[PDB]
Design an enzyme around this catalytic site. Structure first.
Site, PDB file in Angstrom:
ATOM      1  N   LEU A  15       0.836  -1.199   0.000  1.00 25.94           N
ATOM      2  CA  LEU A  15       0.000   0.000   0.000  1.00 25.94           C
ATOM      3  C   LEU A  15       0.873   1.253   0.000  1.00 25.94           C
ATOM      4  O   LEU A  15       0.585   2.213  -0.718  1.00 25.94           O
ATOM      5  CB  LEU A  15      -0.920   0.019   1.218  1.00 25.94           C
ATOM      6  CG  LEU A  15      -1.917  -1.130   1.331  1.00 25.94           C
ATOM      7  CD1 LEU A  15      -2.631  -1.070   2.670  1.00 25.94           C
ATOM      8  CD2 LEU A  15      -2.917  -1.092   0.187  1.00 25.94           C
ATOM      9  N   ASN A  19      10.442   4.813   5.899  1.00 28.79           N
ATOM     10  CA  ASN A  19      11.726   4.577   6.608  1.00 28.79           C
ATOM     11  C   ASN A  19      11.782   3.241   7.362  1.00 28.79           C
ATOM     12  O   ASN A  19      12.812   2.562   7.379  1.00 28.79           O
ATOM     13  CB  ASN A  19      12.061   5.744   7.568  1.00 28.79           C
ATOM     14  CG  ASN A  19      10.889   6.147   8.462  1.00 28.79           C
ATOM     15  OD1 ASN A  19       9.926   6.764   8.000  1.00 28.79           O
ATOM     16  ND2 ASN A  19      10.970   5.805   9.744  1.00 28.79           N
ATOM     17  N   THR A  22       7.387  -1.479   5.112  1.00 24.75           N
ATOM     18  CA  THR A  22       6.245  -1.509   4.201  1.00 24.75           C
ATOM     19  C   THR A  22       4.922  -1.491   4.959  1.00 24.75           C
ATOM     20  O   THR A  22       4.861  -1.819   6.146  1.00 24.75           O
ATOM     21  CB  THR A  22       6.273  -2.767   3.301  1.00 24.75           C
ATOM     22  OG1 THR A  22       6.081  -3.945   4.099  1.00 24.75           O
ATOM     23  CG2 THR A  22       7.595  -2.870   2.549  1.00 24.75           C
ATOM     24  N   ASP A 132       2.500  14.886  14.446  1.00 28.36           N
ATOM     25  CA  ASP A 132       2.684  14.585  13.024  1.00 28.36           C
ATOM     26  C   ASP A 132       1.362  14.727  12.258  1.00 28.36           C
ATOM     27  O   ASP A 132       1.056  13.931  11.378  1.00 28.36           O
ATOM     28  CB  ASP A 132       3.274  13.171  12.840  1.00 28.36           C
ATOM     29  CG  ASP A 132       3.852  12.949  11.451  1.00 28.36           C
ATOM     30  OD1 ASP A 132       4.000  13.922  10.695  1.00 28.36           O
ATOM     31  OD2 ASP A 132       4.147  11.794  11.101  1.00 28.36           O
TER      32      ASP A 132
HETATM   33  C1  LIG Z   1      -5.281   2.404  -0.448  1.00 25.21           C
HETATM   34  C2  LIG Z   1      -4.446   2.677   0.804  1.00 25.21           C
HETATM   35  C3  LIG Z   1      -3.100   3.043   0.711  1.00 25.21           C
HETATM   36  C4  LIG Z   1      -2.366   3.299   1.874  1.00 25.21           C
HETATM   37  C5  LIG Z   1      -0.882   3.694   1.818  1.00 25.21           C
HETATM   38  C6  LIG Z   1      -2.970   3.168   3.118  1.00 25.21           C
HETATM   39  C7  LIG Z   1      -4.291   2.724   3.207  1.00 25.21           C
HETATM   40  N1  LIG Z   1      -4.965   2.713   4.361  1.00 25.21           N
HETATM   41  C8  LIG Z   1      -4.799   2.252   5.600  1.00 25.21           C
HETATM   42  N2  LIG Z   1      -5.785   1.760   6.366  1.00 25.21           N
HETATM   43  C9  LIG Z   1      -5.524   1.468   7.647  1.00 25.21           C
HETATM   44  C10 LIG Z   1      -4.284   1.756   8.239  1.00 25.21           C
HETATM   45  C11 LIG Z   1      -3.317   2.331   7.413  1.00 25.21           C
HETATM   46  N3  LIG Z   1      -2.088   2.746   7.742  1.00 25.21           N
HETATM   47  C12 LIG Z   1      -1.215   3.271   6.866  1.00 25.21           C
HETATM   48  C13 LIG Z   1      -0.119   3.616   7.523  1.00 25.21           C
HETATM   49  C14 LIG Z   1       1.135   4.304   6.924  1.00 25.21           C
HETATM   50  N4  LIG Z   1       0.649   5.677   6.852  1.00 25.21           N
HETATM   51  C15 LIG Z   1      -0.031   6.215   5.672  1.00 25.21           C
HETATM   52  C16 LIG Z   1       0.612   7.546   5.971  1.00 25.21           C
HETATM   53  O1  LIG Z   1       0.920   8.112   4.717  1.00 25.21           O
HETATM   54  C17 LIG Z   1       1.735   6.648   6.494  1.00 25.21           C
HETATM   55  C18 LIG Z   1      -0.425   3.312   8.840  1.00 25.21           C
HETATM   56  C19 LIG Z   1       0.490   3.506  10.032  1.00 25.21           C
HETATM   57  N5  LIG Z   1      -1.641   2.792   8.896  1.00 25.21           N
HETATM   58  N6  LIG Z   1      -3.656   2.601   6.157  1.00 25.21           N
HETATM   59  C20 LIG Z   1      -5.044   2.549   2.049  1.00 25.21           C
END
Ligand SMILES: Cc1cc(C)cc(Nc2nccc(-n3cc(CN4CC(O)C4)c(C)n3)n2)c1
Length: 271
Positions: A15, A19, A22, A132
């Site tokens: 997704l 740093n 993934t 943040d």
């Molecule tokens: C289509 C898509 C792409 C991306 C990169 C994330 C999701 N959704 C999703 N849902 C639940 C938790 C997270 N988390 C994602 C992260 C990483 N964060 C996204 C911030 O840009 C960094 C964390 C700690 N939980 N992310 C959905």
């Protein structure tokens, strides 16, 4: 709370990266149903248990938080790597989504930032500083449902202080007291929410484009702020400036910011 790797299946594709490692889509087999999850996986060719401790701290914060506008931890999983497993918000980061969906209406964006303000109001009440708060750490469950993510830098405040004293340093999202004194409070989260609103109403553009942090710092020190995003409602731009009040004490808290978002949402719904 400690999950079973056998009940968890991970997608091969990422997704998003960073740093730490993934972030991957997964499915976790719960009571008798499966839950779609997002999983933060830690890269450790070498053990460096220091990073490991940061993930468990991040988990430790999420563990204590319970709000509709905050991402929910399912738990953590010790397997071929260390993993933080969260409830999946399918649409992903607000900034990326608004970049790719310019058709989205003012009213919709107001609804979205208002939900964030509600989530932050709770965080303030719980005496946690996010540290943040940016549009990249707001995730969309649907077009009309946003959740605050990423507690890697968050801190539970001491019972006798309203702030956290950090060490050497994200500058674009930091209030002046963070740049100069390393002091992080709900008010500095409020400043950051200002930048986040600016990001939202610019449909995911970067704040302070083409500027070094020291130039941003200097600009703010002389009373200057970002301009109004093209198409942004005036009332939201006014709110951004109030969030960017230099003086910590006169800067509003999330209670007052939330309320001012309620009223303008209902005004836009009733215009
Ligand atoms: C289509 C898509 C792409 C991306 C990169 C994330 C999701 N959704 C999703 N849902 C639940 C938790 C997270 N988390 C994602 C992260 C990483 N964060 C996204 C911030 O840009 C960094 C964390 C700690 N939980 N992310 C959905």
């Amino acid at each position: 709370v400690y999950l079973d790797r056998k009940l968890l299946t991970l997608e091969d594709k990422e997704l998003g990266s960073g740093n730490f490692g993934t972030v991957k889509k997964g499915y976790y087999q719960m009571k008798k149903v499966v839950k779609t999850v997002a999983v933060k996986i830690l890269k450790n060719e070498a053990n460096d248990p220091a990073l490991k401790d940061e993930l468990l701290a991040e988990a430790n914060v999420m563990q204590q938080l319970d709000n509709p506008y905050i991402v929910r931890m399912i738990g953590i999983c010790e397997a071929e790597s260390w993993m933080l497993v969260m409830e999946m918000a399918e649409l992903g980061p607000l900034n990326k989504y608004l970049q790719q969906n310019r058709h989205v209406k003012d009213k919709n964006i107001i609804e979205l930032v208002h939900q964030v303000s509600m989530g932050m109001k709770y965080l303030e009440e719980s005496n946690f500083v996010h540290r943040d708060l940016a549009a990249r750490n707001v995730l969309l469950v649907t077009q009309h449902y946003a959740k605050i993510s990423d507690f890697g830098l968050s801190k539970a405040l001491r019972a006798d202080e309203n702030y956290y004293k950090a060490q050497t340093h994200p500058v674009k999202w930091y209030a002046p007291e963070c740049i100069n004194y390393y002091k992080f409070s709900s008010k500095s989260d409020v400043w950051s929410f200002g930048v986040l609103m600016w990001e939202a109403f610019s449909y995911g553009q970067k704040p302070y484009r083409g500027m070094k942090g020291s130039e941003v710092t200097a600009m703010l020190e002389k009373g200057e702020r970002m301009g109004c995003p093209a198409g942004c409602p005036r009332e939201m731009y006014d709110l951004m400036n109030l969030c960017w009040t230099y003086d910590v004490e006169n800067r509003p808290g999330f209670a007052a910011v939330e309320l001012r978002l309620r009223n303008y949402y209902y005004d836009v719904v009733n215009l």
